[PDB]
Write a protein that binds this DNA or RNA. Structure first.
Ligand SMILES: [Zn+2]
Lengths: 183, 63, 149, 53, 158, 104
RNA sequence: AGGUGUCCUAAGGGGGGCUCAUGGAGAACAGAAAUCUCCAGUAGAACAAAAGGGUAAAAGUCCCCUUGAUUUUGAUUUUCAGUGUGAAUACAAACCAUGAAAGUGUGGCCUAUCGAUCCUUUAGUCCCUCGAAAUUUGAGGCUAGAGGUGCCAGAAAAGUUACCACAGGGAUAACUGGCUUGUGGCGGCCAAGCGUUCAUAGCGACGUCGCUUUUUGAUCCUUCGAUGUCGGCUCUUCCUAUCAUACCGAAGCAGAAUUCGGUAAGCGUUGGAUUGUUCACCCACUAAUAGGGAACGUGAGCUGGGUUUAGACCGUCGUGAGACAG
RNA sequence: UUAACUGAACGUGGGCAUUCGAAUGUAUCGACACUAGUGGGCCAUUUUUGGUAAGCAGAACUGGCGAUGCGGGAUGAACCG
RNA sequence: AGACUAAUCGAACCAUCUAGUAGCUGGUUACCGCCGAAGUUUCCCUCAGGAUAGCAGUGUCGACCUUCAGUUUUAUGAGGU
RNA sequence: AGGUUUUGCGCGAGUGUUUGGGUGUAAAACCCGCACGCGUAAUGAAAGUGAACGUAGGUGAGAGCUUCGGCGCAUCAUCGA
């Protein structure tokens, strides 16, 4: 015997996409090549994010990218491995140069009307094969309706599963102190 | 009929199985419980000093 | 085995029967061994014994892999920045405890030996002083390394 | 018998509901019948429209 | 079988022998600031603001200062996890601790040894190290000659 | 247990907001009217055939009750209520106990 | 080994003066003990109550004044899921008590002295609603207490079945078997004494060491989709802790009749009156009428007298159905 | 808050690494989501309660059987390896 | 006599409600590979049962953060066997 | 039938044709739109009211980028609006 605490312990992160999109498989082949034969950590980080699932790739919006386009970043390349959507509140769109996985119909139209360019990830590897003069962005990960129910309990201020909202539902006892106690 | 009453035979092993996790210490502990009088003053003190830093730009010699 | 001596053995890197390692005796380790006294046998090596242990059973830890030391290039690529470039430097630093003993001895994988040749003794789970085989024998562990390895 | 955090169920299946289950397996068939009736009605009212102001 | 707030505290909360009556007044003149390392030790003669029997002997960090009491943080061990408890104790039960005093003393000398050595030109050897085995030396038998011993026979003493 | 007939304490009135003299009285339960929603709902449930429809308490264990004092302000006629502990014999306005003159 | 379902307008709060239980020595009636005086007196007294902790210019004791036992909501501690109830700790914003002042006070010096949803009832603002629009009655709402669950995290509740039923349990009794041997039976060790004198011919107090599983207890390991549960009749075999038979050793063994011990289980150990009896007690013969085991040997070997289904009678108990190792 | 720029908390600026201030190991760092079975236990060294005692009843730290084969104790779940 | 009422009676026989309910017995169908337990805390007219925490599997995400440790040393506290 | 978490897909501040109509090689396939459901705004019992002082804030960490000075996504802690 050998007296170990762990043995045959698998990994913890994905090692290949679980989707079967033919075009997505091509991206993975290309970036496998790039990350193997380069030294820029930009390539390795892009590779891993190509495997993630739809709840690990939240959408970003023109306002969020517009936020990071200040204080001397008006000429860098934004890269977002996710969808990119429009914001009905941003009244005037700046001049950008974006490289994303897929745009929405209105998002693409508004960017090219201000006078920018929309790319894809293959074109990005063809223009900047090392990520020079780029900045990577993510979306808000904890902005799902299903995350407000995690870890429910007393003194936690979380959201309960109720079939309707109003007076008669889970108000009488344990919330107000006038009927028994409070949480 | 009669049965056993209580025991603590396997509890230490169960607990040490995957560690006794001591919570992680931070840099700015919360002020939940500090005396309300001190709390009132501390709020005002931060408000005043924060304005001085911004003033130190348009104005001068706020060090 | 009780939980306290179990943890100490894990820290000494002795997780299998007939494993061996080098340790430098101080007040913080001489007593630690005393806790696991009914499980180990230890003594004072000499020049011959360390010499054959490194040649015949020397293996190294490289990226967490057991690589047998067959060429001097292996040592230089991993212990060169401490001034060790050959088998004699390793042997010299292990034998005459030097300023880099710590890294030198953590490089080597724990040695796996075979059962001794002439047996052990009638009963081998008592103490050497009474007439057993485990505990602190002073200079008689060299004869045991010869047969065991 | 609740066991975890779920939404409190309320399913009004406690009478003999299986005796009154309606299935619409004749959705296309009825449509055809309605169209036949309209054409017959249109042919009876030869020069007039079908509806009323 | 009962479990009250002071169950089984017959000998813990008691005062000593020939230590009764007046409390030495030097206790009330100490000062505390947040972040100090204090340790709890309850006095039986004062019944106001006293802690439960579990914290009698523990050590914690001050986090609040009030008119006649301080707030201390300590770590309790429930099965398989630790919890941080916040208790209010009167200053008559507390005392400044010498746990970190050695560390503060050592850091001061370390700074000044390093400063002095940098000006002179010799390495430092500042960090401590455990007790190494002894070294060789010689022992003379001049005017000290050995005495021979032997086991002693058996005899009854009573 | 005896308490004085008057005492001065806080008065939460909209214009007193300070200590004032109060008259002391005991609290007696209401007459239990027959038009409360509970009574009307009960009377309908009990009609017709079927019998007794709600529980009736049987297992009594308490020997006493808690006493609650009713206070009345001397200025604005505001009122206050204060509960006491449990007691067997209670009376208000008794004569103060004498000291050291005991004789039988 | 014990304790709680209470008690307190002071037995709470503040301030001030004093020191206790008890011992020594004195003083008309006065004494063992009444009242007065001096000295000593580390708590040996007192603090509502059970026990523990704590207290001496006091937390005791006497004197003076009061009602912090008040209003508004939050944070923290022990039991703990870090839920509820009980209890407790440190502050904040008000209004007060006391003291010259610093200060102290959010019930009892600390550890126990208590209670959810629904319903009823009282206090508070001058508040919201009665949905076609107004005004007064009435009702419904918001915040804080009280009416109670002692099986005390909280259903509304009398018996019998011997006429009985169902799902299960060897997690659970009545019989054998297994571990233990207190009680039951049997045997030793020391020797104060009995035995006319003489401890040990024959016995043995006060103490102490063992053996057996034919008595009765303690436990519930095996069987409840079942191991036929008292006794007697017939038959075989085994044990020795020996009643008689063979041969012997001791005596307070003259003979006869006897008592103690050894080798020895080869061979025997009865006929009847009463009781269902096992157990027992009488009559008579004989060398003697010893003690026990085998699933408390033995029901596809017998019998069915007793216990222990259903019928029925009496006595005591129960209002009654019914109960009784009568 | 203090008689008081006297303090307390939070700060701007600067200085101190040449060596970040005991040993050993790091064959396993942190956080989150959804859910199965279990909720009759038994044995042993040491400590130990009721009982005359028990293959009896009840506890503490640890190690086992249950959930586990192999060599030894002739045989045997718990003993030794 | 709780006796008889079609071999059925301390409440006949026939069809339907009806596949009546069961915290209780019995069964539950091919192979290989990897990981691998509990009989314990609190509450329940709870004690042959449930909820709750614990032990376990799978899916991941943040860094590869360099932090950690059923251990030892040095300094300094508490205890009433 | 109704919930919940996770995996793949389409569109995306919107999304969902099929109750229905037009048409048809006819229970298939293809087209059409007014309403409606969920989401975009909460909180109180209710009458009611209803989300920017700052480049959508300050501090400590943070992958990555960088003209080497710095800018700092997601997320964690904390003080504010
Ligand atoms: Zn008033």
């Amino acid at each position: 015997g050998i007296d170990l605490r762990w043995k045959h312990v698998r990994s913890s992160h994905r090692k290949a996409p679980k989707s079967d999109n033919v075009y997505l498989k091509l991206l993975v082949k290309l970036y496998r090549f790039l990350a193997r034969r380069t030294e820029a950590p930009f390539n390795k980080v892009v590779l891993r994010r190509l495997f993630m699932s739809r709840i690990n790739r939240p959408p970003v919006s023109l306002s969020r990218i517009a936020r990071n386009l200040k204080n001397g970043n008006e000429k860098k390349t934004v890269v977002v491995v996710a969808t990119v959507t429009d914001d009905n509140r941003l009244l005037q769109v700046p001049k950008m140069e974006v490289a994303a996985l897929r745009f929405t119909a209105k998002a693409r139209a508004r960017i090219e009307a201000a006078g920018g360019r929309t790319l894809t990830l293959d074109q990005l590897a063809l223009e900047k094969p090392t990520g020079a003069n780029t900045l990577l962005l993510r979306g808000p990960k904890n902005a799902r309706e299903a995350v407000k129910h995690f870890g429910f309990g007393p003194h936690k201020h979380k959201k309960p599963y109720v079939r309707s909202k109003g007076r008669k539902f889970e108000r009488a006892r344990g919330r107000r102190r006038s009927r028994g106690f409070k949480v | 009929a009669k049965s056993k009453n209580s025991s603590q035979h396997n509890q230490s092993r169960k607990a040490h199985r995957n560690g006794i996790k001591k919570p992680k210490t931070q840099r700015y502990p919360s002020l939940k419980g500090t005396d309300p009088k001190f709390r009132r003053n501390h709020r005002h003190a931060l408000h005043g000093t924060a304005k001085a830093l911004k003033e130190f730009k348009e104005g001068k010699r706020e060090t | 085995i009780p939980p306290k001596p179990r943890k100490i053995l894990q820290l000494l890197r002795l997780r299998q029967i007939n494993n061996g390692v080098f340790v430098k005796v101080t007040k913080a380790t001489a007593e630690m061994i005393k806790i696991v006294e009914p499980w180990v046998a230890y003594g004072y090596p000499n020049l011959k014994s360390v010499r054959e242990l490194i040649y015949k059973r020397g293996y190294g830890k490289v990226n967490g892999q057991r690589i047998p030391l067959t060429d001097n290039a292996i040592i230089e690529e991993n212990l060169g920045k401490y001034g060790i470039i050959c088998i004699e430097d390793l042997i010299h630093e292990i034998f005459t405890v030097g300023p880099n003993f710590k890294q030198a001895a953590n490089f080597l994988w724990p040695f796996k030996l075979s059962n001794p040749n002439g047996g052990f003794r009638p009963r081998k789970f008592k103490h050497f002083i009474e007439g057993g085989d485990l505990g602190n024998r002073e200079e008689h562990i060299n004869a045991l390394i010869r047969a065991m390895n | 018998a609740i066991k975890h955090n779920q939404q409190i169920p309320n399913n009004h299946f406690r009478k003999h509901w299986q005796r009154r289950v309606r299935c619409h397996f004749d959705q296309p068939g009825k449509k055809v019948t309605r169209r036949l009736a309209r054409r017959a009605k249109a042919a009876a009212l030869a020069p007039r429209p079908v509806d009323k102001l | 079988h009962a479990a009250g707030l002071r169950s089984g505290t017959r000998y813990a909360f008691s005062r000593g022998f020939r230590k009764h009556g007046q409390i030495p007044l030097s206790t009330y003149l100490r000062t505390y600031r947040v972040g100090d390392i204090v340790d709890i030790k309850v006095n039986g003669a004062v019944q106001k603001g006293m802690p439960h029997k579990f914290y009698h002997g523990k050590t914690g960090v001050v986090y609040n200062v009030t008119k006649s009491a301080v707030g201390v943080i300590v770590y309790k061990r429930v099965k398989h996890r630790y919890i941080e408890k916040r208790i209010n104790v009167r200053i008559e039960h507390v005392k400044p601790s010498r746990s970190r005093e050695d560390f503060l003393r050592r850091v001061k000398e370390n700074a000044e040894l390093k400063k002095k050595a940098k000006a002179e030109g010799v390495p430092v050897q500042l960090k401590r190290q455990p007790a190494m085995p002894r070294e060789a030396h010689t022992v003379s038998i001049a005017d000290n000659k050995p005495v021979t011993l032997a086991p002693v026979a058996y005899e009854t003493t009573i | 247990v005896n308490v004085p007939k008057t005492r001065k304490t806080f008065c939460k009135g909209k214009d007193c907001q300070k200590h004032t003299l109060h008259k002391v009285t005991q609290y007696k339960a209401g007459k239990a009217s027959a038009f409360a929603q509970g009574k009307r709902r009960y009377d309908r449930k009990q009609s017709g055939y079927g019998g007794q429809t709600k529980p009736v308490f049987h297992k009594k264990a308490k020997t006493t009750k808690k006493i609650v004092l009713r206070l009345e302000c001397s200025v604005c006629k505001t009122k206050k209520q204060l509960p006491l502990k449990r007691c067997k014999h209670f009376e208000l306005g008794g004569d103060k106990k004498t000291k050291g003159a005991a004789l039988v």
